[PDB]
Nucleic acid binder design. Structure first.
Ligand SMILES: Nc1nc2c(ncn2[C@H]2C[C@H](O)[C@@H](COP(=O)(O)OP(=O)(O)OP(=O)(O)O)O2)c(=O)[nH]1
Ligand SMILES: [Mg+2]
Ligand SMILES: [Mg+2]
Ligand SMILES: [Mg+2]
Ligand SMILES: [Mg+2]
Length: 341
DNA sequence: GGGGGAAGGATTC
DNA sequence: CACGGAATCCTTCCCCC
């Protein structure tokens, strides 16, 4: 099997550059403004200029301003990035029917048939990069290997505007050389847990009682890491299906007052239902972020689909359940729909 | 004992 | 000072054959 993974470079920012070359060369930071005051919120992403000085997805916008007071700060326009992405995705289908869009800017393609070896794959990669750049003016990085995981790692190593192939030889080397923290699906929480166990590399998972591993990080994550190291990981490329549609917003100020929270909640329901399109959900969860940035939720699954009126009333109930069951003020409130008919 | 959900949370990206 | 959207996974609990 030969997998070719593609990931758009600093995507949201670069889309902004495409729509405004004047920005190119300058540091760009796409932000998600919350409105609790101004310049409150987080950074969705930033071009590489800006990342050099530490401005990156996740950090508070105020930190960014601090480090780069004169970089350009643009509000995130997701609809636009989505439509550009959808276009690029269609373009990618033309290289394989077997395609897995894993995020708004990445996909894994199974080109085992289309190509005969890594030499051609690399050429198919170039073809793809050029096609995308040519057609959409978007640069992307490509990763190619025997399975999705290593394809992803390949592109991570070649970022930005790169393309890399990790052959069976290199896969054997990485299993022994790659810091397990650089392995997809392993965040800072599982990373540290792996160290308390002495594991710093994939191979290390082969020198510990499964039951112990299964103990520390759960069976799923254990079998995942083990199969990878056993060079036996082989998950296929499959079309992913939306299972949840929701929305969540930040309130101007914290609160435990229902009438003060409702307009935010209802706003989130309207937007969610719009996104539902013609999908009918049988489940709904109200999600709340408390003052201490903790996340709490309460939901319910109906035997039938949920109408907007029903979601309106049921959501207030679930919110009341939250407020009655949690003494903390609420910072962010949202709703999520799932289990579509 | 174990199937079959469901609910609430945790981790990752 | 920290948004937002979703998937997957884990634990707990309940109904009952
Ligand atoms: N709002 C928000 N959006 C994010 C976050 N992380 C990623 N995104 C969005 C915007 C990113 O451009 C896009 C693609 O993520 P990547 O993981 O591909 O980062 P990006 O493409 O920006 O840079 P890259 O070349 O992949 O290293 O997804 C986040 O933490 N918050
Ligand atoms: Mg990217
Ligand atoms: Mg990506
Ligand atoms: Mg990782
Ligand atoms: Mg918690």
């Amino acid at each position: 099997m030969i997998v070719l993974f593609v990931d758009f470079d600093y995507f949201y920012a670069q889309v902004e550059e495409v729509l405004n070359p004047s920005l190119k060369g300058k540091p760009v930071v796409v932000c998600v403004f919350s409105g609790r005051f101004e310049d409150s919120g987080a950074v969705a992403t930033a071009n590489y200029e800006a990342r050099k000085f530490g401005v990156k997805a996740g950090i508070p916008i105020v930190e960014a301003k601090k480090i780069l007071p004169n970089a350009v700060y643009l509000p995130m326009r997701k609809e636009v990035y989505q439509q550009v992405s959808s276009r690029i995705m269609n373009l990618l289908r033309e290289y394989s029917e077997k395609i897995e869009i894993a995020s708004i800017d990445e996909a894994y393609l199974d080109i085992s048939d289309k190509v005969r070896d890594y030499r051609e794959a690399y050429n198919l990669g170039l073809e793809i990069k050029n096609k995308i750049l040519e057609k959409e003016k978007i640069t992307v990085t490509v990763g190619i290997s025997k399975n999705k995981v290593f394809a992803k790692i390949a592109a991570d190593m070649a970022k930005p505007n790169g393309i890399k192939v990790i052959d069976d030889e290199e896969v054997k080397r990485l299993i022994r050389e790659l810091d397990i923290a650089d392995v997809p699906g392993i965040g800072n929480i599982t990373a540290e847990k792996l160290k308390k166990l002495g594991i710093n590399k994939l191979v290390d998972t082969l020198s510990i009682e499964f039951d112990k591993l299964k103990g520390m990080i759960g069976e799923a994550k254990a079998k995942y890491l083990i199969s990878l190291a056993r060079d036996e990981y082989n998950e296929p490329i499959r079309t992913r299906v939306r299972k949840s549609i929701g929305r969540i917003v930040t309130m101007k100020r914290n609160s435990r007052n229902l009438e003060e929270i409702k307009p935010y909640l209802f706003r989130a329901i309207e937007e969610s239902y719009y996104k539902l399109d013609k999908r009918i959900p049988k489940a709904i969860h109200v999600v709340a972020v408390t003052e201490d940035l903790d996340i709490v939720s309460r939901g319910r699954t109906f035997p039938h689909g949920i109408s907007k009126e029903t979601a309106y009333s049921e959501s207030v109930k679930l919110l009341q359940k939250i407020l009655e069951e949690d003494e903390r003020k609420i910072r962010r409130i949202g709703v999520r729909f799932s289990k579509f008919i």
